[PDB]
Amino acid sequence: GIELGRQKIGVMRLNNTFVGDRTYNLRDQKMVIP
Amino acid sequence: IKIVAYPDTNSLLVKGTAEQVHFIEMLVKALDVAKRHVELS
Amino acid sequence: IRVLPRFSADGQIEMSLDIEDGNDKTPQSDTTTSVDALPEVGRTLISTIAR
Amino acid sequence: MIEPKEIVDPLTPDASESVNNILKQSGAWSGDDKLQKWVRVYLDRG
Amino acid sequence: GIATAIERLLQIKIVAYPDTNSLLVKGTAEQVHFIEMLVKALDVAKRHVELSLWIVDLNKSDLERLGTSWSGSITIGDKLGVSLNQSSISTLDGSRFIAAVNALEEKKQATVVSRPVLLTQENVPAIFDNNRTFYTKLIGERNVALEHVTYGTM
Amino acid sequence: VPHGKSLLVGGYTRDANTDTVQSIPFLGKLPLIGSLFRYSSKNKSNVVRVFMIEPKEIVDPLTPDASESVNNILKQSGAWSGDDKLQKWVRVYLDRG
Amino acid sequence: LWIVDLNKSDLERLGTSWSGSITIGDKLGVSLNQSSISTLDGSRFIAAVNALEEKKQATVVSRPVLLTQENVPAIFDNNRTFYTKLIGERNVALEHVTYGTMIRVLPRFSADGQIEMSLDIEDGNDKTPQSDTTTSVDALPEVGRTLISTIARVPHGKSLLVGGYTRDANTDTVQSIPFLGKLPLIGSLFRYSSKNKSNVVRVF
């Protein structure tokens, strides 16, 4: 169950997307998408 | 809860109460799963 | 190639893709520009996501 | 263009088998060398 | 290593003693016993793993060249001249016409097989590096130095 | 990778072919003459590069022992000099302790 | 430490190569197989002829020996050092390149009398360019190095293969003149072929 008293931890897998930030370059500069 | 990695045996060292250790144990078991391979052409 | 693969609910594979196709473009080899550090570079860059 | 697939089986036939076929047909193979075999045996058969 | 791992976990005073490959654990009888058991749990034998890398490189080519190419120039009667296929008249004016002729068939085949072999143990990062290094001088006027380029099989 | 098996980690292949034709607009069409004006070329190539991994578990010591195999090599290759009347005074300490 | 290095090769070169030029009647000239007409205009045609068979064999065995004690890091280093000046205008200095045979080891006995060793191994040498060039004078001593870093358990009086590198290769070429190369006892003067086989074995 992953429970301890009144607290617990939930594991949530994403199925239609990605966890994390997307980074790419435009020649001379770096862009980041949260 | 105090958790320290121990690379030598590919394991974690979890220090706390019996319930706290058990709690973390289950968490680890939930996350520790096998991966499939993907070939990209 | 930089890639991050991921399986979806339907067994589909999504990939984060970064692709570079670079090469060496050159000037007329009969000139001095073939000696001086001028290796003109051609590059094709693609950055996207696809399922 | 992109093409992807899931890998579940080990490479068949094993890499070392295919390599031997290549070396022999290409004439590079020298596993029968009376000298080098004293070492090569440790790699080819352990 | 294990000395660092345990130290961080607890913080009992524990000090490593390399000379006898051992740990010095100071505390109460129960605390020492506790750590003793921990150590016994972690102190286990490792198996060996042999890694072989196969690198195969095959090349094949086929070149055919056959025919001629005409270009050049000529001065005629010191009144006019002719240039053929954009010749460089600035010098070709005092030259002639060239008939380049090519005639070559070329076949080529090559094969290379390379095999690095490396022995290690479970959970132990192993390194194999067969390389070459190119050195060069950067003796400037203020700053001076040597630099290098390293490449190979790693 | 399964014990004693192998996998293709990656690779790169390339196939290519090109050709050219050059000629003199009218002279290139002459029966047994145009050959002196026409020009052609062909260039085909094929490249294959792969990286494969094979791993196994080691449990036994090297058999036969390294020193045995080395002696066989040195003798057959003619480099062996263990019978040198001078050097043996030292070599004995290494070969037999 | 046993270091074994075996080499074998087989080179065959046989045939000809035609190229060059000629001035004809001071009205036109001919270039053969893309010759450098800018100078070849006032030269001639060259018939290069190769004819060489070469066999080669080599073996090297090297054995470093080092005595230490349980849990005592021991060092063995047989090397050479190349020095060079960096006398600039402001900053001046000497620098160097060191390479050779080096062993760093930490031995340890186990419960079964087994010996585990932390091993760092270097096998360096001096690679050189064509000695006929100026690069043999300028501070360019290309260095070759083999590095191994691992851990292994060995039974008393036994041995293990730590690592190695092997290479097998073979290549060949065929060149000819489209029609002349097919002539009964003539084409040999136009055809060209080569073969190059090699085998390399290195172990530690």
XYZ file of C-alpha atoms in Angstrom:
627
model
C 0.000 0.000 0.000
C 3.019 2.226 0.707
C 1.522 3.678 3.870
C 2.953 4.802 7.202
C 0.501 6.143 9.742
C -1.312 9.110 8.248
C 1.076 9.488 5.316
C 1.894 7.630 2.149
C 3.681 7.734 -1.163
C 2.011 7.399 -4.526
C 3.832 6.286 -7.645
C 2.295 7.747 -10.759
C 3.490 6.576 -14.152
C 2.721 8.879 -17.003
C 1.497 7.155 -20.112
C 0.900 9.881 -22.665
C 3.837 12.147 -21.871
C 7.326 12.553 -20.438
C 8.555 13.459 -16.987
C 11.257 16.091 -17.195
C 12.239 19.180 -19.144
C 12.832 19.481 -22.896
C 15.994 21.200 -24.033
C 17.012 22.252 -27.524
C 19.343 24.594 -29.335
C 18.723 27.384 -31.802
C 22.179 27.849 -33.208
C 23.674 30.271 -30.726
C 21.212 29.812 -27.859
C 19.698 27.131 -25.634
C 15.991 26.853 -24.909
C 14.305 24.972 -22.067
C 10.702 23.831 -21.762
C 9.516 22.926 -18.229
C 14.747 8.469 7.747
C 18.386 8.216 6.731
C 19.222 6.585 3.421
C 22.705 6.004 2.070
C 23.661 4.455 -1.238
C 26.153 1.610 -1.340
C 27.343 1.032 -4.964
C 29.601 -1.863 -4.079
C 26.621 -4.194 -3.616
C 24.149 -2.171 -5.697
C 22.070 -1.548 -2.633
C 20.547 0.990 -0.290
C 21.091 1.396 3.426
C 17.902 2.506 5.162
C 18.070 3.573 8.802
C 14.996 4.241 10.930
C 12.266 2.494 12.892
C 11.012 -0.918 11.918
C 7.913 0.614 10.385
C 9.896 3.271 8.556
C 12.226 0.693 7.071
C 9.323 -1.497 5.977
C 7.656 1.511 4.398
C 10.717 2.307 2.322
C 11.195 -1.359 1.469
C 7.849 -1.489 -0.228
C 8.547 1.738 -2.119
C 11.728 0.277 -3.493
C 9.995 -2.899 -4.579
C 7.430 -0.846 -6.467
C 10.109 1.067 -8.373
C 12.629 -1.766 -8.989
C 11.220 -3.156 -12.272
C 12.705 -4.618 -15.465
C 13.114 -2.694 -18.718
C 12.556 -3.680 -22.346
C 14.941 -2.876 -25.172
C 14.326 -0.534 -28.064
C 16.188 -0.557 -31.347
C 16.252 2.639 -33.338
C 16.961 2.865 -37.040
C 21.542 10.953 -32.675
C 20.219 11.644 -29.221
C 17.132 9.703 -28.302
C 14.766 9.032 -25.448
C 12.307 6.150 -26.164
C 9.166 5.459 -24.225
C 6.337 2.949 -24.479
C 2.751 4.111 -24.283
C -0.500 2.457 -23.268
C -1.078 1.048 -26.735
C 2.461 -0.286 -27.165
C 3.357 2.789 -29.183
C 6.855 4.160 -28.995
C 7.404 7.843 -28.450
C 10.785 9.306 -29.002
C 12.459 12.562 -28.256
C 14.686 13.071 -31.274
C 17.703 15.216 -31.930
C 19.349 14.641 -35.290
C 22.450 16.112 -36.879
C 23.705 15.455 -40.376
C 26.910 17.400 -40.902
C 29.483 17.337 -43.686
C 32.461 19.116 -45.229
C 31.633 21.603 -47.972
C 34.591 22.791 -49.998
C 35.585 25.702 -52.288
C 37.521 25.356 -55.515
C 40.507 23.140 -54.627
C 42.710 25.131 -57.008
C 42.658 28.103 -54.613
C 44.524 28.984 -51.412
C 41.251 28.717 -49.494
C 41.730 24.926 -49.690
C 44.769 25.357 -47.395
C 43.703 28.077 -44.979
C 41.482 26.848 -42.099
C 38.204 27.453 -43.921
C 36.507 23.963 -43.951
C 32.975 25.250 -44.650
C 30.592 23.019 -42.755
C 27.141 22.015 -43.871
C 24.678 20.901 -41.216
C 21.122 19.653 -41.115
C 19.434 19.855 -37.752
C 16.152 18.349 -36.632
C 14.588 18.529 -33.197
C 11.147 17.033 -32.569
C 8.976 14.339 -30.914
C 7.107 11.499 -32.589
C 4.970 8.453 -31.788
C 12.754 8.435 -41.615
C 12.403 6.635 -38.290
C 11.797 2.967 -37.635
C 11.721 1.441 -34.139
C 11.192 -2.020 -32.717
C 11.278 -3.979 -29.473
C 14.173 -6.320 -28.871
C 13.603 -9.433 -26.804
C 15.832 -12.155 -28.240
C 19.655 -12.452 -28.154
C 21.555 -11.981 -31.388
C 21.157 -15.136 -33.483
C 23.552 -16.627 -34.541
C 26.002 -15.534 -31.870
C 28.384 -12.743 -32.885
C 31.509 -14.888 -32.603
C 30.124 -17.407 -35.079
C 29.423 -14.831 -37.721
C 32.787 -13.184 -37.212
C 34.602 -16.445 -37.786
C 32.727 -16.932 -41.046
C 33.748 -13.447 -42.151
C 37.399 -13.850 -41.282
C 37.700 -17.158 -43.045
C 35.977 -16.103 -46.244
C 37.834 -12.797 -46.315
C 41.184 -14.581 -45.820
C 42.089 -12.691 -42.618
C 41.553 -15.638 -40.271
C 44.690 -16.950 -38.634
C 43.311 -19.065 -35.803
C 45.431 -21.981 -37.012
C 48.702 -20.088 -36.575
C 51.069 -22.448 -34.768
C 52.378 -19.610 -32.621
C 49.529 -17.221 -31.970
C 47.138 -20.037 -31.016
C 48.963 -20.347 -27.674
C 47.287 -17.107 -26.685
C 44.242 -16.960 -28.934
C 42.886 -20.163 -27.347
C 42.273 -18.186 -24.137
C 39.970 -15.833 -25.947
C 38.266 -18.137 -28.368
C 37.522 -20.973 -25.954
C 38.444 -19.434 -22.604
C 33.962 2.492 0.132
C 32.198 0.872 3.073
C 33.896 3.070 5.633
C 32.440 6.188 4.105
C 29.039 4.644 3.505
C 28.581 3.534 7.091
C 29.963 6.751 8.520
C 27.452 8.808 6.588
C 24.610 6.506 7.522
C 25.229 6.721 11.239
C 26.097 10.399 11.267
C 28.924 5.654 17.243
C 32.462 6.421 16.134
C 33.904 4.463 13.234
C 37.418 4.804 11.880
C 38.945 2.960 8.958
C 42.258 1.178 9.375
C 43.685 0.231 5.918
C 46.762 -1.450 7.317
C 44.739 -4.480 8.433
C 41.793 -3.940 6.076
C 39.531 -3.378 9.020
C 37.164 -1.042 10.808
C 37.425 0.355 14.308
C 33.996 0.686 15.906
C 33.679 2.542 19.203
C 30.496 2.598 21.275
C 28.464 0.523 23.707
C 28.472 -3.236 23.582
C 25.087 -3.231 21.900
C 26.105 -0.550 19.428
C 29.216 -2.456 18.446
C 27.265 -5.684 18.012
C 24.726 -3.856 15.883
C 27.397 -2.566 13.536
C 29.119 -5.946 13.500
C 26.068 -7.581 12.041
C 25.689 -4.826 9.444
C 29.217 -5.397 8.279
C 28.701 -9.129 8.016
C 25.651 -8.548 5.844
C 27.577 -6.328 3.431
C 30.928 -8.205 3.340
C 30.178 -10.695 0.525
C 32.168 -12.254 -2.330
C 32.000 -11.094 -5.946
C 31.922 -13.006 -9.230
C 33.979 -12.106 -12.277
C 32.696 -10.829 -15.585
C 34.555 -10.966 -18.869
C 33.592 -8.476 -21.522
C 34.294 -8.869 -25.212
C 33.664 -6.149 -27.774
C 33.488 -7.013 -31.422
C 34.119 -4.276 -33.938
C 33.593 -5.166 -37.566
C 34.338 -2.887 -40.493
C 33.753 -3.916 -44.118
C 34.458 -1.834 -47.243
C 33.776 -2.356 -50.921
C 34.177 -0.051 -53.900
C 34.123 0.103 -57.692
C 35.493 3.025 -59.725
C 35.355 3.405 -63.481
C 36.714 6.329 -65.476
C 36.867 6.481 -69.237
C 36.991 9.215 -71.838
C 38.423 12.608 -72.654
C 38.135 16.284 -71.778
C 38.910 19.172 -74.102
C 39.892 22.696 -73.115
C 42.518 25.349 -73.736
C 43.360 28.035 -76.257
C 45.158 29.397 -79.279
C 46.490 32.629 -80.755
C 45.567 33.078 -84.395
C 47.415 35.463 -86.717
C 48.136 37.848 -83.825
C 44.690 39.348 -84.454
C 42.335 37.064 -82.605
C 42.345 34.043 -80.342
C 40.051 31.216 -79.323
C 39.175 29.822 -75.913
C 37.695 26.379 -75.473
C 35.313 25.617 -72.641
C 36.144 28.642 -70.492
C 39.892 28.237 -70.486
C 41.986 30.726 -68.478
C 42.863 32.943 -71.480
C 44.994 35.288 -69.328
C 47.739 32.651 -69.624
C 46.169 30.249 -72.151
C 46.530 32.924 -74.860
C 50.197 31.846 -75.142
C 49.530 28.110 -74.749
C 47.652 25.324 -76.538
C 44.688 22.945 -76.370
C 44.771 20.094 -73.902
C 43.164 16.715 -74.386
C 42.909 15.062 -71.020
C 42.420 11.330 -71.258
C 41.251 9.091 -68.450
C 41.216 5.313 -68.498
C 41.044 3.486 -65.218
C 39.164 0.639 -63.648
C 39.520 0.117 -59.919
C 38.244 -2.550 -57.557
C 38.781 -2.447 -53.816
C 37.983 -4.622 -50.830
C 38.825 -4.360 -47.157
C 37.984 -5.933 -43.822
C 38.928 -5.186 -40.242
C 37.996 -7.015 -37.061
C 38.968 -5.636 -33.683
C 38.378 -7.260 -30.332
C 38.989 -5.575 -26.953
C 38.814 -7.871 -23.924
C 38.346 -6.746 -20.322
C 37.986 -8.647 -17.015
C 36.281 -7.180 -13.925
C 33.941 -7.997 -11.042
C 30.324 -7.454 -10.123
C 29.594 -3.767 -9.638
C 33.210 -2.764 -10.375
C 33.760 -0.044 -13.064
C 36.485 -1.214 -15.376
C 38.486 0.772 -17.853
C 40.263 -0.252 -21.025
C 41.963 2.386 -23.101
C 44.236 1.786 -26.073
C 45.173 5.185 -27.418
C 47.620 7.562 -28.994
C 48.484 11.084 -28.038
C 49.606 13.912 -30.263
C 51.519 16.714 -28.588
C 51.942 20.316 -29.701
C 53.508 23.535 -28.440
C 51.598 26.666 -27.537
C 54.582 28.801 -26.641
C 53.104 32.237 -26.775
C 54.721 35.348 -25.500
C 52.941 35.570 -22.166
C 51.341 32.215 -21.700
C 53.079 29.071 -22.775
C 51.884 25.497 -22.704
C 51.698 22.085 -24.240
C 48.502 20.604 -25.507
C 47.467 17.363 -26.925
C 44.982 15.275 -28.811
C 44.133 11.828 -27.531
C 42.175 9.224 -29.449
C 41.805 5.469 -29.710
C 39.775 2.524 -28.451
C 38.109 3.056 -25.113
C 22.574 -9.724 -22.204
C 21.921 -13.443 -21.397
C 24.980 -15.316 -20.166
C 27.117 -16.497 -23.069
C 25.031 -14.636 -25.649
C 25.494 -11.442 -27.554
C 23.722 -8.290 -28.708
C 24.161 -5.744 -31.407
C 24.723 -2.449 -29.650
C 24.833 -0.312 -32.694
C 26.272 0.398 -36.059
C 26.366 2.392 -39.218
C 25.943 1.459 -42.825
C 26.258 3.348 -46.052
C 25.450 2.546 -49.627
C 26.122 4.909 -52.499
C 26.354 5.140 -56.252
C 26.987 7.928 -58.720
C 27.657 8.454 -62.384
C 28.394 11.155 -64.940
C 28.255 11.663 -68.680
C 29.950 14.449 -70.587
C 30.185 15.052 -74.282
C 30.610 17.387 -77.185
C 27.069 18.225 -78.503
C 27.698 16.905 -82.005
C 31.076 15.186 -82.104
C 30.120 12.725 -79.386
C 27.601 11.139 -81.762
C 30.095 10.176 -84.457
C 30.250 6.365 -85.225
C 33.856 5.566 -84.285
C 34.974 9.054 -83.414
C 32.706 10.335 -80.626
C 34.578 8.109 -78.136
C 37.373 10.698 -78.341
C 35.007 13.400 -77.090
C 32.695 11.530 -74.724
C 33.460 11.020 -71.053
C 31.895 8.888 -68.400
C 32.408 7.807 -64.846
C 30.973 5.453 -62.263
C 31.547 5.260 -58.540
C 29.948 2.687 -56.259
C 30.657 2.028 -52.599
C 29.394 -0.029 -49.669
C 30.283 0.371 -45.972
C 29.326 -1.704 -42.928
C 30.287 -0.985 -39.312
C 28.962 -2.744 -36.218
C 29.562 -3.033 -32.480
C 28.591 -6.238 -30.706
C 28.769 -7.246 -27.049
C 29.425 -10.654 -25.562
C 29.765 -11.281 -21.815
C 30.399 -14.300 -19.631
C 31.044 -15.325 -16.038
C 34.543 -16.351 -15.071
C 35.002 -18.917 -12.335
C 38.064 -20.978 -13.233
C 41.756 -19.939 -13.269
C 43.483 -19.600 -16.616
C 44.245 -23.092 -17.931
C 47.036 -23.886 -18.744
C 48.885 -21.453 -16.507
C 50.208 -18.330 -18.235
C 53.865 -19.171 -17.632
C 53.495 -22.502 -19.413
C 52.042 -20.982 -22.527
C 54.630 -18.227 -22.563
C 57.462 -20.725 -22.481
C 55.965 -22.541 -25.453
C 55.776 -19.262 -27.359
C 59.317 -18.201 -26.601
C 60.779 -21.521 -27.594
C 58.900 -21.863 -30.857
C 59.524 -18.233 -31.758
C 63.264 -18.619 -31.040
C 63.375 -15.860 -28.388
C 63.798 -18.202 -25.419
C 67.143 -17.972 -23.684
C 66.477 -19.728 -20.390
C 69.497 -21.950 -21.019
C 71.916 -19.017 -21.174
C 74.886 -19.965 -19.004
C 75.086 -16.444 -17.610
C 71.575 -15.075 -17.373
C 70.256 -18.239 -15.699
C 71.973 -17.149 -12.465
C 69.268 -14.530 -12.145
C 66.424 -15.933 -14.218
C 66.189 -18.957 -11.891
C 64.843 -16.632 -9.180
C 61.933 -15.670 -11.355
C 61.190 -18.896 -13.114
C 61.379 -21.192 -10.094
C 61.618 -18.717 -7.221
C 52.772 -9.365 -14.990
C 53.013 -11.041 -18.339
C 52.754 -8.897 -21.431
C 52.675 -10.711 -24.738
C 52.691 -9.040 -28.133
C 52.603 -11.000 -31.405
C 52.656 -9.566 -34.946
C 52.306 -11.108 -38.376
C 51.992 -9.542 -41.812
C 52.007 -10.280 -45.535
C 52.365 -7.608 -48.234
C 52.222 -8.159 -51.969
C 52.568 -5.480 -54.629
C 52.777 -6.142 -58.333
C 52.044 -4.192 -61.481
C 52.264 -0.793 -63.105
C 50.716 2.666 -63.059
C 50.536 5.039 -66.005
C 50.231 8.814 -65.880
C 51.817 11.983 -67.205
C 51.776 14.150 -70.301
C 53.097 15.316 -73.633
C 53.296 18.384 -75.859
C 52.389 17.659 -79.457
C 53.388 19.933 -82.340
C 53.167 23.011 -80.094
C 49.435 23.076 -80.874
C 47.942 20.615 -78.447
C 48.908 18.371 -75.571
C 47.679 15.244 -73.835
C 47.223 14.448 -70.162
C 46.989 10.903 -68.891
C 44.920 10.045 -65.848
C 44.607 13.576 -64.473
C 48.268 14.472 -64.559
C 49.327 17.908 -63.262
C 49.493 19.550 -66.723
C 50.633 22.898 -65.256
C 54.119 21.349 -65.088
C 53.537 18.053 -66.936
C 53.050 20.004 -70.186
C 56.872 20.193 -70.400
C 57.502 16.643 -69.150
C 56.740 13.059 -70.178
C 54.757 9.922 -69.338
C 55.726 7.906 -66.302
C 55.378 4.166 -65.940
C 55.597 3.332 -62.281
C 56.410 -0.296 -61.655
C 55.986 -2.100 -58.363
C 57.239 -5.573 -57.565
C 57.596 -6.557 -53.955
C 56.747 -9.437 -51.699
C 57.144 -8.949 -47.968
C 56.778 -11.281 -45.010
C 57.131 -10.157 -41.419
C 57.027 -11.737 -37.987
C 57.616 -10.381 -34.510
C 57.257 -11.346 -30.871
C 57.779 -9.534 -27.600
C 57.428 -10.798 -24.048
C 57.768 -8.444 -21.116
C 57.662 -9.368 -17.463
C 57.558 -6.857 -14.578
C 58.079 -8.328 -11.108
C 57.145 -6.640 -7.831
C 57.349 -7.749 -4.169
C 55.155 -6.285 -1.405
C 53.142 -7.168 1.698
C 49.530 -7.686 2.646
C 47.575 -4.452 2.330
C 50.656 -2.481 1.213
C 50.333 -0.422 -2.039
C 53.364 -1.095 -4.162
C 54.647 0.835 -7.114
C 56.763 -0.219 -10.059
C 57.529 2.293 -12.754
C 59.962 1.839 -15.622
C 59.730 4.956 -17.737
C 61.271 7.597 -19.921
C 60.857 11.323 -19.822
C 61.020 13.780 -22.674
C 61.815 17.366 -21.762
C 61.023 20.548 -23.671
C 61.363 24.304 -23.239
C 58.477 26.723 -22.968
C 60.528 29.885 -22.718
C 57.974 32.495 -23.544
C 58.399 36.171 -23.077
C 56.547 36.529 -19.795
C 56.168 33.029 -18.513
C 58.904 30.500 -18.942
C 58.992 26.847 -18.016
C 60.023 23.320 -18.739
C 57.563 20.599 -19.486
C 57.734 16.968 -20.092
C 56.166 13.793 -21.339
C 56.499 10.649 -19.283
C 55.602 7.173 -20.471
C 56.538 3.560 -19.869
C 55.591 0.469 -17.885
C 53.741 1.150 -14.673
C 52.109 -1.006 -12.046
C 50.189 0.086 -9.000
C 48.894 -2.727 -6.867
C 47.100 -3.441 -3.633
C 47.098 -7.180 -2.692
C 44.844 -8.764 -0.140
C 44.263 -12.290 1.126
C 40.748 -13.635 1.436
C 39.135 -16.318 3.566
C 40.041 -19.061 1.118
C 43.656 -17.960 0.676
C 42.706 -16.191 -2.535
C 44.522 -13.046 -3.510
C 42.578 -10.014 -4.605
C 44.347 -7.188 -6.265
C 43.507 -3.669 -7.197
C 45.316 -3.218 -10.490
C 46.394 -0.201 -12.458
C 48.479 -0.977 -15.521
C 50.167 1.252 -18.067
C 52.020 0.124 -21.155
C 53.350 3.177 -22.957
C 55.750 3.556 -25.868
C 57.148 5.934 -28.477
C 55.335 5.944 -31.809
C 57.151 7.712 -34.609
C 56.414 9.315 -38.015
C 58.562 8.928 -41.101
C 62.121 9.650 -39.908
C 62.902 11.344 -43.227
C 60.687 14.301 -42.271
C 61.139 17.374 -40.065
C 58.522 15.983 -37.683
C 61.279 13.660 -36.402
C 63.040 16.773 -35.027
C 60.194 18.946 -33.780
C 58.856 17.960 -30.319
C 56.203 15.589 -31.648
C 57.072 12.197 -29.975
C 53.644 10.595 -30.529
C 52.941 8.428 -27.520
C 51.059 5.169 -27.533
C 49.493 4.017 -24.281
C 47.516 1.038 -23.085
C 45.632 1.539 -19.861
C 43.888 -1.021 -17.691
C 42.104 -0.428 -14.413
C 40.300 -3.282 -12.663
C 40.080 -5.730 -9.717
C 40.635 -9.478 -9.756
C 40.777 -12.495 -7.443
C 43.389 -15.114 -8.229
C 44.014 -18.548 -6.580
C 47.487 -18.948 -5.113
C 49.987 -19.963 -7.779
C 47.474 -19.551 -10.605
C 46.883 -16.910 -13.195
C 44.183 -14.890 -14.936
C 43.814 -13.026 -18.154
C 43.167 -9.429 -17.207
C 42.642 -8.129 -20.654
C 43.856 -7.757 -24.158
C 43.365 -6.620 -27.684
C 43.396 -8.433 -30.966
C 43.149 -7.331 -34.545
C 42.774 -9.147 -37.807
C 42.692 -7.412 -41.164
C 42.947 -7.974 -44.881
C 42.673 -5.773 -47.937
C 43.236 -5.896 -51.654
C 43.091 -3.758 -54.782
C 42.904 -4.190 -58.529
C 43.609 -1.503 -61.091
C 43.739 -1.712 -64.834
C 43.436 -0.093 -68.203
C 39.863 -0.820 -69.501
C 41.012 -2.609 -72.646
C 44.774 -3.062 -72.523
C 44.626 -5.016 -69.280
C 42.872 -7.854 -71.116
C 45.626 -8.503 -73.646
C 47.091 -12.105 -73.549
C 50.722 -11.405 -72.630
C 50.562 -7.644 -72.617
C 47.909 -6.608 -70.079
C 50.348 -7.446 -67.249
C 52.102 -4.181 -68.162
C 48.922 -2.228 -67.433
C 47.310 -4.181 -64.598
C 48.089 -3.557 -60.949
C 47.259 -5.432 -57.814
C 47.999 -5.442 -54.138
C 47.370 -7.492 -51.027
C 47.859 -6.630 -47.387
C 47.160 -9.003 -44.514
C 47.937 -8.536 -40.837
C 47.357 -10.177 -37.464
C 47.942 -8.676 -33.998
C 47.654 -10.202 -30.524
C 48.201 -8.401 -27.213
C 47.458 -9.755 -23.743
C 48.003 -8.969 -20.068
